[PDB]
Amino acid sequence: VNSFSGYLKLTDNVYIKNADIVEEAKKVKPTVVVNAANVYLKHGGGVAGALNKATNNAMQVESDDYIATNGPLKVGGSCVLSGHNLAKHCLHVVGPNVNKGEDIQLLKSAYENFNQHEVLLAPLLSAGIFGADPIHSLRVCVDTVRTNVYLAVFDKNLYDKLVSSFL
Ligand SMILES: Nc1nc(N)c2ncn(Cc3csc(C4CC4)n3)c2n1
Numbered sequence: 001v002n003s004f005s006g007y008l009k010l011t012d013n014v015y016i017k018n019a020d021i022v023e024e025a026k027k028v029k030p031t032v033v034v035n036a037a038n039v040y041l042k043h044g045g046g047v048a049g050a051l052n053k054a055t056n057n058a059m060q061v062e063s064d065d066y067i068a069t070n071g072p073l074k075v076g077g078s079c080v081l082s083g084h085n086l087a088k089h090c091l092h093v094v095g096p097n098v099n100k101g102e103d104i105q106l107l108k109s110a111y112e113n114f115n116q117h118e119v120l121l122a123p124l125l126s127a128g129i130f131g132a133d134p135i136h137s138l139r140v141c142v143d144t145v146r147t148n149v150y151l152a153v154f155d156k157n158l159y160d161k162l163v164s165s166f167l
Contacts, residue, residue, distance in 0.1 A: 002119060003028055004150045010166055014141060015150050018159035021047055021123050021152040022054045025086040025149035030150075033083055035059075035116070036130065037092035039072040041079075046129040055084040063092070075102050076109030091117060098131030107137065111144040119148045128154075138162055 005013035009108065017024070025033045036047040041063035043052035046097035052059040073079060078093040095110040110125050124142055126132035134153075141149065153159040 002148075004030075004121075007150055008163060010138075011142055013146060014128055016138075016149065016151045016153060016159070017053070018154075018156045018161060019152040020050075020087070020154055023122065024152045025051075025083075025121060026054070027155055028121060029087060030083075030119065030121040031088045032091050032117045032120040033087035033089075033093045034120055034125075035090050036080070036123050036125060036128065037073070037078075037094050038097065039075060039077075041067055041073070041092060047123045049120045051086065051090070054086060058082075058084050059090065076106040078110075078113035083128050087121070091120065091122075093122075093125060095126035095130055095137075096124065097129075099129070104132060104136075107132065107140050108144050111141055114141075114149055115147050117147055119150075121150050121152060123152060123154075134158055134162060140167065 007017045009015055035051050043049055073094050075094050075096055080116050081090050083090045093110050093113050096106045109127050124134050124137040127134040127137050
């Protein structure tokens with residue numbers, strides 16, 4: 001038993017809700033919140049900009065030190081950093097950005113990072129400003145993630161479309 005509430009159950013291990021990942025995180029304090037990161041951990045907009053703002057820019061400060069030490073992530077890769085006031089940990093995952101021409105097949109590699117964590121609150125990778133089809137992203141999530149994932153979908157219209165079209 002865990003503290004997530006109001007989710008619809010899609011599969012054995014995948015759950016979905018129309019919600020603000022920022023407010024969902026501050027209420028739940030999940031062990032892991034997933035950020036829709038880029039390779040530079042520049043948290044300027046979308047989910048990343050929202051999460052970073054909610055941390056009072058502490059996420060960005062920590063991320064800049066990470067990059068200065070380690071260099072950029074790979075597309076499809078991830079790193080674990082602090083969750084600040086939102087979660088114990090933040091798993092920064094780089095899905096391919098279609099608006100940069102990145103290969104959508106790396107979306108499966110991106111979701112594989114979730115399997116290193118037993119339970120996660122997450123957005124749909126490569127959705128929103130990353131330019132992928134959120135319905136494809138949901139299918140890849142369901143077919144790749146085996147751990148327990150709670151997906152927060154900000155847009156109510158999109159949430160209803162994801163549920164109604166789910167096979
Ligand atoms: N659940 C939730 N909460 C927010 N506050 C929010 N903002 C943008 N998106 C959609 C989204 C999913 S992946 C993504 C980035 C790759 C660009 N953007 C949001 N989803």
